[model samples]
Target: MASPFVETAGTSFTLNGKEFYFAGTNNYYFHYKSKKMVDDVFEDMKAMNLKVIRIWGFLDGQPQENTVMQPRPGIYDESGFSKLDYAIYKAGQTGIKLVIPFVNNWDDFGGMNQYVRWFQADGHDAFYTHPDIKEAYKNYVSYMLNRVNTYNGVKYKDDPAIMAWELANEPRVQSDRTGNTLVEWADEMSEFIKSIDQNHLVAVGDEGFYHIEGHPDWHYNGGEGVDWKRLTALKHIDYGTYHLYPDHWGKTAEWGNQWITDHICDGKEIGKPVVLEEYGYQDKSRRDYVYRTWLELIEKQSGAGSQFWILTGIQDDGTLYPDYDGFRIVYPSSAASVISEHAERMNEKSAAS
Candidate 1:
């Protein structure tokens, strides 16, 4: 039997039958567009030979404009959802598989904090254990997984275009640095998503930070980042997930390269496919160096996939988000050359055994 574009077999992602590898990118605004605009983005990606896209799967409701996907806990906004529906349907048509994240830990697009605020004014730590908040989160999960794409009228659970469903966009539990809290939370949520959708895969969407067992002093002083090994080992999780930001961690580009390779090793140890789902550099001059170096390492290591920070439709200067502009690649440029070259290289070879 042939597999879909992405499927977990033994320990790696095999496409059609052979090992699958991809050069992908993130597009946080994928669901925030008209169907035509969404189609346009996919068209550009196809031209670049990009295989997969990681897009925002959750948007919290707020008073701000375009900041609402699920305005009220159980209630949804059809207009926002219909746009997503069309995007999903179009992805199937375009032969692009999507990795959709369910929520975020930050304030952008109404993250987990927004859910707590909806029911009560509890602080950030309260989101993990709060009764009302947990219930609301589950409701949101059920809503998204069960959503029927209005365009093709196919329920999301049956949609092969969706390769994986992530629990959150960088889920962190600052309240419990030991890493058990988020692990427990992830255990529950991963099972929940799998229970609903039997065809797709699930990931925690963590930043690959470790503080759980052996690395008590994980070299990262920041508050509780989830332990990659422990989280990825969950029976319900199909693969390991990681994101790298050199500048964000105040590390050099060389350090970023090693950091990525180290995580790939860790994933290999755990016996599953690993994806560097998010990574980027702020320096435009170093963009090509950073990308090519990472791509070469990922390919050599037999890594399952690698995706740069973002690729957007906005081409003009001074019109996009300040942080987004430095990292954004619109289309057909020197940067596009790098993407196309690496994407081709990724496709031509099978993942290392």
Candidate 2:
């Protein structure tokens, strides 16, 4: 059998030495959902030909329920990790790869803020510079990388189901605003991850904010402490990742096109693949057109890949999950159809390439 590991060749991904262009989706619920629910989602993904999934791999502090992965520093809940192990096993079985982020920038799942609380750091930005906090984060990362899946008896670092390890979800340091702190942190963390897990790729998992001084827009003006170019150029970071939400970013759809173009241009310069990792538009009327236009541009420009914001399917109650964020795309729906078609086109492009 061919090795499931995916490799990078210049600005494209190569699977078993063939160019691999993929269309995928993101999901935050895979690690905590029931086995049946997780299986349903994977089956839908397989049907849609989605080759990769980016799922949240970190849950810090105690949750209202029992889903917390790390309840405290240097401690964990086996049950919580078992869920993730099961998801990784399912990904291998389904021939789908995974992109897992080690932590979250926001507090949704008791993210960086929880670490800040535990370490009594000066502020959220301290998570990057605080020595104790950084060590704690590295410890968590080592544990995850060395963990052997309880279900399949495969160590996570040795498993081919995983495509990449992201540093954090949309990480930023508002205090510095110049992106130096975040870049330094990313450099250290990525190098550490490479040292421990040589089999997988590493990414910054940022929103692709620029660091241009005196730029008109905040996204381009180095206000978020995320320098996409510098971060992507790090020696250990194998690829580039960015999220898009024009509505949330206070920009129009037209602006979004330029954003995509700029990232592709940067990826070309860096000689790496750049993924549109998470993007969404809630407006049902214009979502399809916008997505199609973006996908077409990506294909034409030879961007590495794209993954929509989310994909959710049958829940434990045997009912389709509601789109709370208005970005969820379920199988057998119009949105799913658009993604499926794009998947086909991407596959064709890869073959021809």
Candidate 3:
């Protein structure tokens, strides 16, 4: 039987007809990692009770040809796609739902820039406006949503192990800093996804930047081409998502509390659940303390869910993956303990409610 698909119910999520407030984590490498590594990561998450995992669904024009899912516009690599299929198959086995994004705002894994370059579009913003680029994007979306998992024989659109399809990872149009460009793009893309696949939810995958007038901070100001309220309010956007990185954003840890509160309130206003989808602080010494404070605010405010920055597992050599970004959280660590406890608390609260 198919697992119960996750649904949004006005500021919260439901699974199998009951409230579901999850504690999840991000690990972008799952789509390309060896099966052993992927299994190890899933086993570790099962132990932590992490029910959702956000992973990269799109890898384009990578230098490593073997790992590039989309080698060129309108073309795909079967071997690369099979890796993601295995990840989804594993998620189904472990009962950990997957949240996959179609593209990335950054160039890390051949994101939107790759599309722009492939189509020879005018600029980065052309990825949002150019007809050829938009069609290419829709083609990719159609291919993925309609793809049948080679392992499970379930279509990606019908699989309950896949929780949602994110529009992009931290998408923005610098040329259209007023935020309208990305908003329009998201409106189209999200609506298109819904038209094709109605089984799962959709999200902007933005960093929850505000487009408020005259806001002092860049994150709050409209410079980022992201209007959290507008994006969350989109008809096809089932929920809202925001990422936080105080160190990277030039903000204080205490300041992040307010950011969390603001998004929760926005979700309430928009009448949809909002997730602190990706958050991190590089200071290992103070990471737990910082995460605890944010998690507490999420709990107190009744925010829908949260997923920490990155969770890496063991390698073939029997050693954990190296922390290249300084935000990696390994199992059996102090940081993991704090997140696991929060997961328990969140799950209990969901059950009680």
Candidate 4:
């Protein structure tokens, strides 16, 4: 049986008293694809000995072929729900826990910004303070929490396959650099989620961006609209989350190494488990070097886990897809071997500790 996951004490998750350090990836398309494709991805992750998966639980907008999770504001599509149901059920069968991000920051999946657009508001800022938008967001959250999984016939709140509920996929607010807007939003949404389902963990899903008021070290390469300390300090938030990309942040790989150490240290002080939830590079050849350094550093710091940006397997035509934009680690290859080895290291360390 798949046991319920929890963060009762702090800094570590437990499955019936065993520490649960994770090895996983960002597979947003898991619930938007064919049944065979979904099964293949989970089986491939099983072969890699991965412990957790971060998949999209919310896809706002149209009821098209792929983007069907939340086709409209109130209407739920059966086809989309079926795909998601199979994904969760199979993950449980494979003994893999899941991190379900409730929404996205970017428009790729009709994220928060898209929700704001539905109101015909000015910009992303409207998502934070607008009355109607907040109501809509809350309604969506309640609906998802209460919805039943078609495959397992279990409501999401009672499902053990789900390990945590992320507030958003890297939520950011470039408009209000003061950082209060995003922080307030995270606090409110986290409380709302807890009121309904107290069984699962909750993470803010900010990219570890620190506000400018304090901590010079945190502000060195800061992004907008996040108060790292204040955000993680919320009573309802069970853990911390961050994403790392040296190239995108205009920093060197060496700097990336320091970033990992910095966040892990912060997590230690926060007394909460932290996840390097999304981190990857665009250089396919040197990815092994980056992954190795990150894995060792994260493990040494006693961090909870790390997840690459994306992972995909063969296409229906039986031909492999190219490492698109240099993020994929195709299975049964040297790069995949690097991931598998580090995952084993994470497992062993968690088990022994």
Candidate 5:
């Protein structure tokens, strides 16, 4: 059976059956907007044996409070979209799958940053709870998803180049912010996407599938952040998604994936699929450690999948990460002997579906 996912070489995926071999490359907007830049970056990653590109997509003048700034409101930014197109096209051409996450949700002013910030700044939590705000949310998902649905291989939503539709990045219900409840937000968003795009897999990106706040007695109904108990319940939504940053969570895959897989996966009763969508290990004294743990985990689970944190990063002067090991795989083979060994087998082959 073919998988419903869009970005893979094939629909049906298996740890032993297919190859995922994705190295996380975090060049948010640098290489995505310029056709030449994109062409160059994608070519480099492909050469390194990496097959996945992760991108965070945001509209113009984002990070607003009740209203957008500089850039016009209610309008999508297409300035870099052409580059984005080039990157996606190149990924398809070079056999790399792309993952575009909508709405980073880090700052309250940008798109949907903080739940309570929406209410605190506006004096009411209506944006998330209000009918208009709800409708706007629906429209946002529909429009972007429609773009993915219609990507035509060379342009727009006609191409099946994108791998998954991440509803939001690091979503959490800040006490000072308001979005009903994280669970409520995820559930509603998942259902909304299914209603529009039926063929793609959806993930609710919450750094960890744990709660961020207190939901003692379901205070706000959907529960709170810091509470893993409530978040893991959202399983049927397809693919368990989490972001990994060694500095914050813990270093090493043994520690990191163990923290996530054990805590998040244990609570959810329904089982659709589980893959470590994002995990990044930065500059280290021993690169082999980061590489080994990942392959070890894959061997241990016999079914889990992974997407490395990133392939490339930009610096203060609009430059890519200087060190080979700083970003992308195989830069330091001596340090990354273990990683290069298995980075070669995470994704499968392609066919014209």
Candidate 6:
């Protein structure tokens, strides 16, 4: 049996089921510590009663190179997630569930010559595509899925530590034109994950389908919205996952929320649960705006539940902001406590009747 997990509508899990209240940090672009960072982070998270974490990936503790050359984004951590097992294990001990994202296309969109070379290497299709990046996508998905499946401390399928197995963190919003099809990729990837592990809930790991309506694109692709439409609309997917960092991407947080709401809410009708798998404002000043709007929106979701973008961070007093949005930080970090505090409190109050 897999660890007991919850879902929004049916058997699969979404952001809408849990009280949320995830107070954690995102070690995305760089996080390869075998020391005790994961454990330390989780300990801090639990100190605030945090319950969720958004952990990104680049292969199970594999060394992360620029694959191109920014060579100075600085090495993320000396140890390749040598601390991850400790994080997961300690998280389980603390009753915390972690959201594991498998990839980030950050390096791909860095530049022209460099981008091409990066994709050529880990592009999944570049090297894997047999008849020239043709069928390699299938192979890539299988390869990635297999990696997540066999990750450390993964055998206890029934352990509550693992919340959901995500395909790739914010996939397809890349700067490439070959090896992957947006809508088709979502279709295949979703099936691939479910086909392997049916016990835990799964999320698409998309960033609110940025290319759908086309607001602020980095590379500018002219594909239709069919991909976003189909991906968010898929029933096989438990909760449609997407990230929201409008300011960073030159989009507004409200716009980010609306885009996701429109799709999951079916533009007019209703649809599957919409989970803002990733969202942050990067400043402390915007907390109320982001918090109030996000809470109300989540409350109004189809299944009436949702997950916020973050769960951990430090406060100005040098103390920790455990269920409190780090007020002075100015921007958002998508921490759990910051995102879910208001929602959980409001829900409890509303249910007092």
Predict model 1's lDDT versus the native: 0.79
User: Candidate 3: misplaced stretches above 4 Å?
Assistant: 1-3, 63-65, 215-220
Error of 1 at 40 (Å): 2.5
Q: Flag the better candidate by lDDT, 3 or 4.
A: 3
Q: State the displacement of the C-alpha of residue 61, model 4, in Å, after optimal TM-score superposition.
A: 1.0
- What's the lDDT for residue 14 in model 2? 78
Clashing pairs in 4: none
Runs with alpha carbons beyond 4 Å of true place in candidate 2:
1-3, 215-220
lDDT ranking, high to low = 3, 2, 4, 1, 5, 6
Model 2: colliding residue pairs: none
| Reference-based lDDT, each prediction | 0.79, 0.89, 0.90, 0.80, 0.51, 0.48
| Lowest-sum lDDT 10-residue window in model 5 | 7-16
The sequence of per-residue lDDT tens digits that candidate 3 reaches over residues 65-154 is 367789888888876799999999989888899999999899988999999999887678789999999999999999999999999899
Where in model 6 is the C-alpha error above 4 Å?
1-3, 8-25, 29-31, 34-36, 47-49, 60-82, 108-158, 173-180, 210-226, 253-257, 267-270, 300-340, 346-353
Q: Roughly what TM-score does model 6 have, to 2 decimal places?
A: 0.65
Give the alpha carbon lDDT tens digit for every residue of 152-229 in model 2: 899999999999999999998877767899899999999999999988989999999888876545654488888899
* Candidate 1 lDDT tens digits, 1-353: 67774788655687777777788888877666655556667877898878888988777877234645888788888766776787788788888889988888888888988887888856876777777888788898998889888888788888988888998898888767677788888898999888888888998999887664544443553356577788999989999898888887778889888877988888778888889999888888878878888888888887888887777664234243335457777676677778788888887775342
Error of 3 at 96 (Å): 0.6
TM of each candidate vs. truth: 0.92, 0.97, 0.97, 0.94, 0.72, 0.65
Candidate 4, lDDT over the whole model = 0.80
Clash pairs, candidate 3, are none
Give the true-structure RMSD of model 3.
Answer: 1.7
Error of 6 at 93 (Å): 1.2
Q: Model 4, 176: alpha-carbon shift in Å?
A: 1.1
Assess the local accuracy of residue 309 in candidate 3 as a C-alpha lDDT between 0 and 100: 88
